[PDB]
Design a protein around this motif. Structure first.
Motif, mmCIF file in Angstrom:
data_model
loop_
_atom_site.group_PDB
_atom_site.id
_atom_site.type_symbol
_atom_site.label_atom_id
_atom_site.label_comp_id
_atom_site.label_asym_id
_atom_site.label_seq_id
_atom_site.Cartn_x
_atom_site.Cartn_y
_atom_site.Cartn_z
ATOM 1 N N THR A 188 6.538 1.096 3.389
ATOM 2 C CA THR A 188 5.733 1.995 2.537
ATOM 3 C C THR A 188 6.022 3.456 2.924
ATOM 4 N N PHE A 240 7.872 5.967 0.792
ATOM 5 C CA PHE A 240 7.315 6.784 -0.315
ATOM 6 C C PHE A 240 6.730 8.123 0.160
ATOM 7 N N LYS A 260 -7.715 11.901 -0.699
ATOM 8 C CA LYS A 260 -7.450 11.952 -2.147
ATOM 9 C C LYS A 260 -7.625 10.566 -2.766
ATOM 10 N N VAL A 261 -6.993 9.612 -2.096
ATOM 11 C CA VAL A 261 -6.997 8.200 -2.502
ATOM 12 C C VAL A 261 -8.409 7.640 -2.569
ATOM 13 N N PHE A 284 -8.129 4.243 -14.255
ATOM 14 C CA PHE A 284 -6.914 4.283 -13.417
ATOM 15 C C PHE A 284 -5.632 4.329 -14.220
ATOM 16 N N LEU A 318 1.394 7.000 -12.987
ATOM 17 C CA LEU A 318 2.101 7.698 -11.920
ATOM 18 C C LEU A 318 2.848 6.730 -11.005
ATOM 19 N N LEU A 363 6.638 6.623 -9.765
ATOM 20 C CA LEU A 363 6.880 6.291 -8.363
ATOM 21 C C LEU A 363 7.643 4.994 -8.155
ATOM 22 N N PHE A 400 -0.154 -2.467 -3.782
ATOM 23 C CA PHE A 400 -1.517 -2.097 -4.217
ATOM 24 C C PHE A 400 -2.512 -3.067 -3.578
ATOM 25 N N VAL A 460 -9.311 -2.821 -8.637
ATOM 26 C CA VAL A 460 -8.569 -1.554 -8.531
ATOM 27 C C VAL A 460 -7.062 -1.793 -8.520
ATOM 28 N N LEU A 519 -4.364 -0.578 -11.421
ATOM 29 C CA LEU A 519 -3.244 0.286 -11.047
ATOM 30 C C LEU A 519 -1.933 -0.358 -11.482
HETATM 31 C C1 HEM Z 1 -5.548 1.250 -3.943
HETATM 32 C C2 HEM Z 1 -4.373 1.631 -4.443
HETATM 33 C C3 HEM Z 1 -4.016 3.126 -4.588
HETATM 34 C C4 HEM Z 1 -4.740 4.136 -5.077
HETATM 35 C C5 HEM Z 1 -6.183 4.136 -5.623
HETATM 36 C C6 HEM Z 1 -3.934 5.337 -4.995
HETATM 37 C C7 HEM Z 1 -4.358 6.602 -5.363
HETATM 38 C C8 HEM Z 1 -3.542 7.707 -5.406
HETATM 39 C C9 HEM Z 1 -3.950 9.053 -5.740
HETATM 40 C C10 HEM Z 1 -5.391 9.482 -6.063
HETATM 41 C C11 HEM Z 1 -2.859 9.829 -5.678
HETATM 42 C C12 HEM Z 1 -2.740 11.335 -5.972
HETATM 43 C C13 HEM Z 1 -2.457 11.660 -7.465
HETATM 44 C C14 HEM Z 1 -2.510 13.165 -7.676
HETATM 45 O O1 HEM Z 1 -1.531 13.781 -7.171
HETATM 46 O O2 HEM Z 1 -3.527 13.604 -8.264
HETATM 47 C C15 HEM Z 1 -1.730 9.004 -5.331
HETATM 48 C C16 HEM Z 1 -0.422 9.411 -5.190
HETATM 49 C C17 HEM Z 1 0.623 8.699 -4.626
HETATM 50 N N1 HEM Z 1 0.542 7.367 -4.282
HETATM 51 FE FE1 HEM Z 1 -1.116 6.261 -4.215
HETATM 52 N N2 HEM Z 1 -2.692 5.014 -4.459
HETATM 53 C C18 HEM Z 1 -2.727 3.660 -4.197
HETATM 54 C C19 HEM Z 1 -1.698 2.928 -3.625
HETATM 55 C C20 HEM Z 1 -0.450 3.409 -3.289
HETATM 56 C C21 HEM Z 1 0.581 2.687 -2.569
HETATM 57 C C22 HEM Z 1 0.393 1.260 -2.010
HETATM 58 C C23 HEM Z 1 1.649 3.485 -2.478
HETATM 59 C C24 HEM Z 1 3.032 3.253 -1.834
HETATM 60 C C25 HEM Z 1 3.213 2.750 -0.630
HETATM 61 C C26 HEM Z 1 1.309 4.724 -3.164
HETATM 62 C C27 HEM Z 1 2.157 5.801 -3.274
HETATM 63 C C28 HEM Z 1 1.782 7.042 -3.738
HETATM 64 C C29 HEM Z 1 2.636 8.211 -3.745
HETATM 65 C C30 HEM Z 1 4.092 8.210 -3.220
HETATM 66 C C31 HEM Z 1 1.934 9.205 -4.281
HETATM 67 C C32 HEM Z 1 2.360 10.647 -4.547
HETATM 68 C C33 HEM Z 1 2.651 11.615 -3.424
HETATM 69 C C34 HEM Z 1 2.780 13.036 -3.962
HETATM 70 O O3 HEM Z 1 3.332 13.145 -5.093
HETATM 71 O O4 HEM Z 1 2.287 13.922 -3.228
HETATM 72 N N3 HEM Z 1 0.018 4.664 -3.645
HETATM 73 N N4 HEM Z 1 -2.165 7.701 -5.155
#
Ligand code: HEM
Ligand code: HEM
Ligand code: HEM
Ligand code: HEM
Lengths: 141, 145, 141, 145
Positions: free
Chosen positions: B37, B40, B65-66, B84, B90, B95, B102, B136, B140
């Motif tokens: 992971t 990323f 943020k998450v 979502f 996204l 991505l 997830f 969730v 996603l």
């Molecule tokens: C419960 C599942 C997840 C949720 C709720 C979640 C939520 C989010 C949120 C809120 C953002 C920021 C969006 C913004 O820029 O406004 C984001 C970006 C991102 N997520 Fe997650 N995410 C989840 C799982 C994952 C997983 C498992 C990965 C990969 C291992 C991942 C990779 C990324 C990446 C690479 C970004 C963007 C980084 C950037 O552009 O700065 N996400 N996600």
């Protein structure tokens, strides 16, 4: 495949589990049955009510097998032969279920050893459980 | 998803969750536990070791943020697909995150809650929580299914 | 974990592949990139065009590592340590990709060795490929 | 889903697939390659060996049914979710088949086609075909999604 570091971490975590292995074993089953109700289909003959003496006794069996595996980290297939036999050949448990119990088991250890359950230990325990799972779902005999 | 019973439960508990802390711990453990992971978040700097990862400021920051997105979902528990949609887009479209990932994060989330609440996060409470994360994760992964 | 029948099946099937290893290795890559386009993001510096000499040459390398693994069925970790380092540590390939490639290879083999690609051989190769995949995604260093 | 081409190709290819034959081999290979799947087919009798499995009349007959649903599915590539609605209910609600398994079968089916058609089953055709089996796996998994 486990690093030497994984093996030490597994041993360390397990030493902390100590005499509570059975209890943790029981709680984990307990959590699995509650969160993943489809796992119950494998135990039609079990009293699956909350607090069952049966689930408790079974937890001890599971914990006992895991300690055996911890002791034979270098020969799991050898250590758990009788168990693959049962899980893979006899019961034909879908591999996905092994992921449910592993998760359940990590949830359990985390809640009881918050200090000890470091990210590193978490990482090694996950690998170990994936390893046991593979042995238990393989028909190598 | 959750019954009203379960809606209440999930909601009350959440009220006590320290989003800051949990978030950063959840994202950090993901990266350490499921190393691929890390691919990323290459841009986040040093993720060399558990220590590095756990102490990475960008990791901490992003974890928040998450979890924030999580908190919101909790509010729109009956329309997670919609809430979502944007993220689905996204993560899936841009991505190219494999949706299995997830499930890993949600699961990590549950482990962290357990580490932080101990006995407070009961088998019965966890059970309710599992439905949420499943929800969730499916919301996603929407752009796929 | 492989049984003795599993190892027999792998050695025999790989034996039938013989001198066409590279070709099959190349076709598996081509089928992978075409069916699962997300795979391509691991080779941004590659010309993934039809018949790229790069793909064909890569196909050769992949096939040579599998031969090496067939020759070392009893010590994959030892045999593939360098490849684990690459794929696990350096590249950080998501393990789902290994499944896509394994599938891609099986499709290739079935299409080229139909009378040899029996249900038994199919089972044994699938397991062999999952074992390799495990090694390549493990950081045992 | 497929576009005009993917569809037509997929279609045309299908016209050559002997459902009877191919379905029995596909189901059979599933039980052989991913043996936990035998648990759902207990009533089928003897599944003790690979030969027993491949030669079992219940396996063969059931395999043909599976392929019939596929052939139908091929006529309604537009609405796979709608077409598989009843099966979705059966598999999900009554059988409780982990959705991961639907993918294994679809993959085994593609292996089977490759076996039976050799070079004729081109990389390009294989690809449109991967789309199809993924669509079918998703339709069946709907009572999950
Ligand atoms: C419960 C599942 C997840 C949720 C709720 C979640 C939520 C989010 C949120 C809120 C953002 C920021 C969006 C913004 O820029 O406004 C984001 C970006 C991102 N997520 Fe997650 N995410 C989840 C799982 C994952 C997983 C498992 C990965 C990969 C291992 C991942 C990779 C990324 C990446 C690479 C970004 C963007 C980084 C950037 O552009 O700065 N996400 N996600
Ligand atoms: C960490 C992975 C697991 C370990 C170490 C483990 C260990 C054991 C042990 C030690 C026994 C009892 C053997 C005896 O009779 O002495 C057993 C039985 C059993 N296990 Fe597991 N098990 C695991 C995973 C699973 C999973 C995931 C399932 C299905 C959800 C499962 C289903 C069963 C069943 C149905 C029995 C037989 C119960 C009875 O009739 O006594 N096991 N297991
Ligand atoms: C059985 C599974 C696999 C085997 C045996 C394998 C084998 C190899 C070999 C032999 C090399 C080159 C080593 C050298 O430089 O001599 C390599 C490099 C590489 N592999 Fe794999 N591989 C496998 C799976 C994968 C997967 C699933 C992916 C991602 C989709 C992948 C991505 C790469 C990349 C990006 C490189 C570096 C290419 C370059 O820059 O030359 N590999 N692999
Ligand atoms: C492409 C995915 C699949 C399709 C299209 C499919 C199709 C079918 C059909 C058409 C039937 C019979 C319906 C009827 O009774 O009218 C059926 C029944 C059944 N399916 Fe599937 N199936 C799929 C995957 C699976 C998988 C992966 C499993 C389990 C490993 C499974 C287990 C069963 C069982 C146990 C039955 C009922 C057995 C009986 O009562 O004779 N199916 N399926």
């Amino acid at each position: 495949v486990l690093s030497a570091a994984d093996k030490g971490n597994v041993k360390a975590a397990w030493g902390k589990v100590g005499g509570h292995a059975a209890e943790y074993g029981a709680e984990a089953l307990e959590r699995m049955f509650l969160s993943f109700p489809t796992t119950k289909t494998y135990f039609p003959h079990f009293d699956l009510s909350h607090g069952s003496a049966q689930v408790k006794g079974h937890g001890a069996k599971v914990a006992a097998a895991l300690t055996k595996a911890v002791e034979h980290l270098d020969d799991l297939p050898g250590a758990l032969s009788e168990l693959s036999d049962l899980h893979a050949h006899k019961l034909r448990v879908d591999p996905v279920n092994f992921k449910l119990l592993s998760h359940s088991l990590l949830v359990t250890l985390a809640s009881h050893l918050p200090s000890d359950f470091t990210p590193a230990v978490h990482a090694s325990l996950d690998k170990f459980l994936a390893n046991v799972s593979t042995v238990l779902t393989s028909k190598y005999r | 998803m959750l019954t009203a019973e379960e809606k209440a439960a999930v909601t009350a508990f959440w009220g006590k969750v320290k989003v800051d802390e949990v978030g950063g711990e959840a994202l950090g453990r993901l990266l350490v536990v499921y190393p691929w992971t890390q691919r990323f978040f290459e841009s986040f700097g040093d993720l060399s070791t558990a220590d590095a990862v756990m102490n990475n400021p960008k990791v901490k920051a992003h974890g928040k943020k998450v979890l924030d997105s999580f908190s919101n979902g909790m509010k729109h528990l009956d329309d997670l697909k919609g809430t979502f949609a944007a993220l689905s887009e996204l993560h899936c479209d841009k991505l190219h995150v494999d949706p299995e990932n997830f499930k890993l994060l949600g699961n990590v989330l549950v482990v962290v809650l357990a580490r932080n609440f101990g006995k407070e996060f009961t088998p019965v409470l966890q059970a309710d929580f599992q439905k949420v994360v499943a929800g969730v994760a499916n919301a996603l992964a929407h752009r796929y299914h």
